[PDB]
Amino acid sequence: GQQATKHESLLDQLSLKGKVVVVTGASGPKGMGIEAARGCAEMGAAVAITYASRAQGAEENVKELEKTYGIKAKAYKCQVDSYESCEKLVKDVVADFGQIDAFIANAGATADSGILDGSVEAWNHVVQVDLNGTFHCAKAVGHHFKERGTGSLVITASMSGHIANFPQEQTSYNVAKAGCIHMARSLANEWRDFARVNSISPGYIDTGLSDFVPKETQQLWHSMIPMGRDGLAKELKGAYVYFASDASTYTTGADLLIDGGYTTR
Amino acid sequence: PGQQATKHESLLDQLSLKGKVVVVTGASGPKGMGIEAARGCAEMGAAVAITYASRAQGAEENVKELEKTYGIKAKAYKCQVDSYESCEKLVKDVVADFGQIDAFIANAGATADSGILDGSVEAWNHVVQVDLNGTFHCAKAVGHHFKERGTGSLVITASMSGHIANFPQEQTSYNVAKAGCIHMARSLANEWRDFARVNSISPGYIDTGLSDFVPKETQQLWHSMIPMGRDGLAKELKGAYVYFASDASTYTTGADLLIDGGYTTR
């Protein structure tokens, strides 16, 4: 198995000084990814972020992390739907930064229909990115964690992995996120001698990812969220740092719902 | 909008499948979940279509046993659930041969034999393609038929591996795929809320032959973890399949039923 933190103080437990964190899908301006990276940078991590289509957005984010926190930071192209791209990512980050201590598997894409209206290829694309893309990052980084004897993998899942969203149909997305949640549990057991694995399941977060949804659908959502509002990505940074850091050295195979209370109903 | 309650008051009338057609994928083995679901449905009066992949002879013998024992019409079809074209063809053939499909039991599946670090990417892909995308292919192929008819019941064989992580054998690709299958039933129950019910059954360790690739000493460790202290038998699951497939469950949709001898209570 794995050992308890040697730190007594919580600020020592939360510190990421001397550690390297990778955040996939942190190229946008206010997503879960850039906020997780900001939290880790604030705790002193060196941070590697990835992009797929938004190179300029990721380069801007890296310059912001450098300006605000003075950390070692860098952006990488990664298509998580390709295992070869995830393998190269881990190879390049280990080369450039020396090691990877925590890996935040955060990249994902949305669905826009149920299974009968959607084509088989539309199902394949969402499963390839959201489910197999997360498996590709886990396998690629897990080989590194096994050689080092330590590591933390944090998977961004979704409350859609627990419930079926309404009124928009998106079963392919719901199913892939469900697989991600159980992947965290199953890898926590597989990797029990060398690494922790946990998942965070956000509710409706105002990141821009849902901008393709009509306005009037989004006001229905609000009546279903007990808190009555969308979340903000900066309300999730504490959870990412919690799982990536030594504040959670007995936490493995857990899922943390962050959803304004949506799943309580 | 929505679905209606059974008209039947008697439970025996509710459970009857006389006049109805049931498809069971992966029912070619002699003592698997598939043939026992098919037996239970045929006993209630269903016409039954079963599928095989590699066990063509076992499927023909099962069909003959179903017909002679229960007096029903049955037929076996070759189907590779990992191919949508094969699943679409199955639904078309059964609807042509039998006239309709009232219940579909998505039961075909294959096992994993390693965790993700020891396994290749292709070994992962194979298990997900069969167990997760194969269930999706069958769900989509038959759901177009259910939507046209305005009724239907889809029953998915998941696994307790979709809830917990097996020990000591590593099989994460199988665990993840089955977990996807469980939530697929919940999400499709909501998607199809106007015309069909969808539910899953999550068996524990069932003595079907599927686990024969695992040493017997590892199977002795499983028994100490099962509160009932034994493997199940496929004949102990037939009532759940018939429950979901019939009118005994017209308000049950999006449910999962663990049949694991208590394994998940610890």
Added chain:
Amino acid sequence: PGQQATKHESLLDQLSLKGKVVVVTGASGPKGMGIEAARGCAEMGAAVAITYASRAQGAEENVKELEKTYGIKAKAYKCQVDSYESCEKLVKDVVADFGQIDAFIANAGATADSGILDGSVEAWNHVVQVDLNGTFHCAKAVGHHFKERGTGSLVITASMSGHIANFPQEQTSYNVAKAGCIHMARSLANEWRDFARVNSISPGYIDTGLSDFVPKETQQLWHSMIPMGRDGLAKELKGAYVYFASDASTYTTGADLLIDGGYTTR
């Protein structure tokens, strides 16, 4: 040491309750889960004991319908599940009158009508005492009998309120009690692993008369939240009670079955 699989192969033999005795608490109303469970079990050939608290007459009417319709031995007993002495007396009287108890359906229950801040401490205690401790009283009372006989099946009526928080009415005491009932079934399934099975059924909104104190605008809002779009009917639940009480489920223990028209899928 653990429990054994059913001897029967055919589903109708597994489902039969000929020669067995079923107790259903709280089956005094004309269309509740309780009387429909008793009808399902009686249809399968069981002798049936039902209980009442305030509705002695309705329980008597039900015994007479059960006997006329199904030709079985039936009898009504007064029982206050909130009193352990009364549950102990129930099991003692039924065993004296019927010879034994094979299946026990712990179904009696009462609602709450506020959250914890608007409610008094007495209001909390009353709901917990009836719904949680009353289920415990029956389980303990009959469990001593199951342990002596080496066999048995306990079926607990929980609620989807044990999984989610109902909206817009506040009823946290009832939610909490029902969540305890659900986990009581998992925990007793493990505790009683050598001699009896325990499972729960979690109904959604069922048109039994129990929510007749709820206004109409509120009930129409519920329907928009139910994917099936309608209240359930108690006759749609009899199949689940019989499944768990009979030998159709000899590998099923520690399971919960949501019967909620899809409500908890969202």
Added chain:
Amino acid sequence: PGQQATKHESLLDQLSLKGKVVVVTGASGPKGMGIEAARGCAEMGAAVAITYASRAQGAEENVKELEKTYGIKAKAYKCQVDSYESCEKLVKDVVADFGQIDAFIANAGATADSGILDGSVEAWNHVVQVDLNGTFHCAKAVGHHFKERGTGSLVITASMSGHIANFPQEQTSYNVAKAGCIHMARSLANEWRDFARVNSISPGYIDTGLSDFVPKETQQLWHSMIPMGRDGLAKELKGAYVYFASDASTYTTGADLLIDGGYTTR
């Protein structure tokens, strides 16, 4: 009308409890969840009220340590959570002494030592009274205060016993009580949606001294069932208490966090 997101952008500012007051029940022991939660909150700048039942001297030493180590105001109170009057008096006294309560950590609890057949009804009532109703008593007492102020965070120490049945020791009363606490957090998260967050933490086996009565050879069977292969330490949980108590979790409500070395993954 709902609750709002933190105004802070920096995580350190979000975690800060400067100017806030935290109550931690049952923090009188030397290495329990309570004193580590209290140390975590003191480290972030909170004023801290801790309670004791039997260990008055242990609580006073803890208060002297908190004030010496962290330079904060701290105070010990006697509280019997099984008595509503005591919990109501606790909130009144802390509000009078400190001015307000911003976060309340409902952590006091007691263990069970048998299953329901070996245990008496008294033994069941005692555990439920302390572990379920004691938590309700604190929730009700502080929630009246949270409602008045329009802000607050309630953190409930539940247990993985609220999710699974421990083996080999039988403790169904405790398991059931902890399952009530877990759902109580979800249900109050919704009831209190306009003014306060409610969340639970479910520890696995933590080396606090609470399990010192368990035979040592039973404890090493536990370790074989924990993927991490060891007991936890209370200092590994202080991060989670501070997370829920502070502004680092202003969109997190109705959540449960398992901290169990992976025990429930199997």
